[PDB]
Design a protein around this nucleic acid. Structure first.
Lengths: 88, 272, 44
RNA sequence: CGGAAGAUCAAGGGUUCCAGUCCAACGUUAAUCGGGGCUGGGUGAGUCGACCCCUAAGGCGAGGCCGAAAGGCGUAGUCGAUGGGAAAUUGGUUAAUAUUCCAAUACUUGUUUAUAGUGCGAUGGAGGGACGGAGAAGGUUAUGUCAGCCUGGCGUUGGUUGUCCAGGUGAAAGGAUGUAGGCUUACAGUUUAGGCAAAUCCGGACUGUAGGCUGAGAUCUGAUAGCAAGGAAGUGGCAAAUACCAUGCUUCCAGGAAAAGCUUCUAAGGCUAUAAACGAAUCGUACCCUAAACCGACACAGGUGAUCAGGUAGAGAAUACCAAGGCGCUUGAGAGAACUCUGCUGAAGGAACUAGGCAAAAUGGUACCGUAACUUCGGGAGAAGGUACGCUGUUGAUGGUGAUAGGUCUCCUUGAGCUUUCGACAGUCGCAGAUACCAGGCUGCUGCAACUGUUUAUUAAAAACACAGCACUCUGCAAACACGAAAGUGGACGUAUAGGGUGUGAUGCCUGCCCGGUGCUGGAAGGUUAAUU
């Protein structure tokens, strides 16, 4: 439907990899739902940034790090991020 | 025949192998084959229920027609093959209608001859006949015990039975064990003696030749401790006890036959 | 020298795992006993 | 160090990976450093692997069988990889990912639409997939080495513009082609005791007519890529794998997975070509992995499967020195006693040591000569014991590859260049030429066990166990025997030339007497004898 595509993109990634990729290949890096396929991401980007056409989507699951605090051992959420290529 | 090996190695000094240059050097007929994995002499409980089994060479099962229910249809011996599942050789049959089967091979049976099954069949090695259509005194093998069940007795290399006579609806036979036996006259048998008559004549030569056949070493009971065998125990060498199996059963003459329903099918045995 | 543990994940989950416990009457008694003690680790 | 202490993984671990920052604790010392603390970043796939389809051992197992209960077994099935089943390589790029990103060039498999032609369809039938050990002769390549070519250099000390020195320099998958090899008569027709029914498909029986499949590598294309000093080269010889041809070939017995994918046939009742567009999900991907990250409580001298495999010598994956790459093993500084450990050398003697030549010393290579008792004729045997070995020059013989010519991935003769293996003669230097590392000590008598093997993980490796062979005995098949409570199993889809138990233990010569005891086998005249009545 069109009420599940609003929850596919969790937020853009701001890093040296994401900033270097944009300037050279114009590929947006996003943090996506833990259940979003490559098709859902493709259908979420083009609906929600009108005027762009996605060539490909490269997804990956990256695991959260164990960051201990105080007396406890705790881990960060795992998350999924996608590289999406837009038509030049 | 037998061929002694030259003593080029200590393991080859007493290797006397049986050699048959007339048996197929190719592969068995594919469709009459079945996968068959070793059991290590273990039952469905995973327990060793027969010792000294384990190892050996992988081998297929050849489906031997022990029944021979293709009567009045002639079959020609296509080839005589070696069988790893038994000591006897096996003849690849080629029935008129093209159906191919394996049977135990008679000693006097070559490639090209025709074999017959049924009641109106010639008395020649290979043919399968009911015991009433076989004249007395001929040498037979592949003896049936139940009607229609297939050959049970005299199926090993060199096996043969003497059809001594008839006393009604039974057929008096003299088995190679020396036991005279009556069998229903409607049961079938094959004419001739079983091939590979020089099998007992061989010599393995080395411990590894018995390992190739799936046989594991056997430890004498007097080489054990008393917690493992009744023969176990002793300072030095000693027997001390009457000979007995590891389960406590005499092994020097104790007769072990429990059947009381087949007791009337046995005429006598032989004393020597 | 070779030591006693020598881990294997498929072998661990197949002899001590959750589904291995639940496939026997006595394995379910193991799980019930871990739960009654309040253990945070039921199965390996 | 360099058959790793270098690289790629699997397992296992799980962020240890990269950067910035800090030095309390941790690191056997210090620490500004770290696999430590803290804060950020990092793992990109239709083609790699998993998942998926298929099955092995082995599980579970509608109904079924068995069992006080719990449960045990088992059919159809359904799971279960360590195996079978589709497909890409080169190069660049990040601090950290790369067959994933980017560039170039490919490949595999689907969906939808259209144009034609048109009998399609299986969980079933038949093919196929599909397989053992050893060995041998080749043909190759990866790779190496020299040469060519390009770019630099003219050398702190005699000489070095040359036949000099250094560095660099060889593009793959794929597509054409079809070679060295390997296999191999083809078609048509008639018909049918068979493949559980059916079948045009297989199998079987008859009648006429007379190169193909596979396949390394080379070649062409791919191919004006990329790659250094700021805009260069990029092609010839020789050598050569354990990798490929090759799941081949030849042999032997110990006789060599299964199932599916795939090709065909029909049973009940859409398919094949042509393209055009579109797609190929999800999970893993960092990093260690002969280890400081795994198993050993430790940053522990242990253990840990697979893959890659440079040079000079060398038979070699031994050994020595090096390459690429990676390290100096997380306390140092002194001194240079006894004593301890690990080594080197040792006058004269040479086992006098000692329980005992324990340890040490010694031998050690290749070729040729020569070699005893005894023997099962194989052996013993490398018995024992000798001689030669470096370098330089000349010279004889020889295998391979083959440019140039003479008579189309071709054939024949000649043979340049390179290379192989053997000799002879002459000279020459040293104490010493198998110069280093590496690398048998050998004999005589005698007990034991035939031998190869096995064993007390962690004080015993042996004469102990096993062993081929021998004997006795049991067992006629629902076999004896064994597991089990039984069902169900093994024995065995075996059948007395078989299977079990027991003893002995190759082989040669052999294996005497005793049946009183205790077993075992056979017999029943008599005596005694249970429940029961």
């Amino acid at each position: 439907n069109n009420a599940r595509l609003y929850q596919v993109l969790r937020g853009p990634v701001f890093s040296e990899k994401s900033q270097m990729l944009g300037d050279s290949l114009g590929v947006q890096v996003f943090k996506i739902d833990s259940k979003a396929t490559k098709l859902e991401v493709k259908k979420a980007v083009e609906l929600m940034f009108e005027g762009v056409e996605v060539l490909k989507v490269n997804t990956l699951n990256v695991k959260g790090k164990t960051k201990r605090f105080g007396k406890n051992i705790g881990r960060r959420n795992d998350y999924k991020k996608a590289y999406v290529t837009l038509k030049a | 025949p037998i061929v002694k090996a030259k003593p080029t190695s200590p393991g080859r000094r007493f290797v006397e192998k049986v050699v048959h240059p007339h048996l197929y050097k190719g592969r068995p007929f594919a469709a009459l084959l079945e996968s068959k994995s070793k059991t290590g002499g273990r039952n469905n409980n995973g327990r060793i229920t027969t010792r000294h089994i384990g190892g050996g060479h992988k081998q297929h099962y050849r489906i031997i027609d022990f029944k021979r229910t293709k009567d009045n249809i002639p079959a020609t011996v296509e080839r005589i093959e070696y069988d790893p599942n038994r000591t006897a050789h096996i003849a690849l049959l080629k029935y008129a209608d093209g159906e191919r089967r394996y049977i135990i091979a008679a000693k006097k049976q070559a490639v090209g001859d025709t074999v017959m099954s049924g009641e109106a069949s010639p008395i020649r090695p290979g043919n399968c006949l009911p015991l009433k259509n076989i004249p007395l005194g001929t040498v037979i093998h592949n003896i049936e015990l139940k009607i229609g069940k297939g050959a049970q007795m005299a199926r090993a290399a060199g096996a043969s039975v003497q059809l001594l006579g008839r006393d009604g609806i039974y057929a008096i036979l003299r088995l190679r064990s020396g036991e005279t036996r009556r069998v229903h006259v409607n049961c079938r048998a094959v004419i001739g003696e079983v091939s590979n008559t020089e099998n007992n004549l061989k010599s393995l030569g080395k411990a590894g030749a018995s390992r190739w056949r799936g046989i594991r070493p056997s430890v004498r009971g007097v080489a054990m401790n008393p917690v493992d065998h009744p023969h176990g125990g002793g300072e030095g060498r000693n027997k001390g006890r009457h000979p007995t199996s590891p389960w406590g059963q005499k092994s020097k003459g104790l007769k072990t036959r429990h059947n009381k329903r087949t007791d009337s099918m046995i005429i006598r045995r032989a004393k020597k | 020298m070779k030591r006693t543990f020598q881990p294997s994940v498929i072998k661990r989950k197949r002899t001590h795992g959750f589904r291995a416990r639940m496939a026997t009457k006595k394995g379910r008694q193991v799980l019930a006993r871990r739960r009654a003690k309040g253990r945070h680790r039921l199965t390996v």
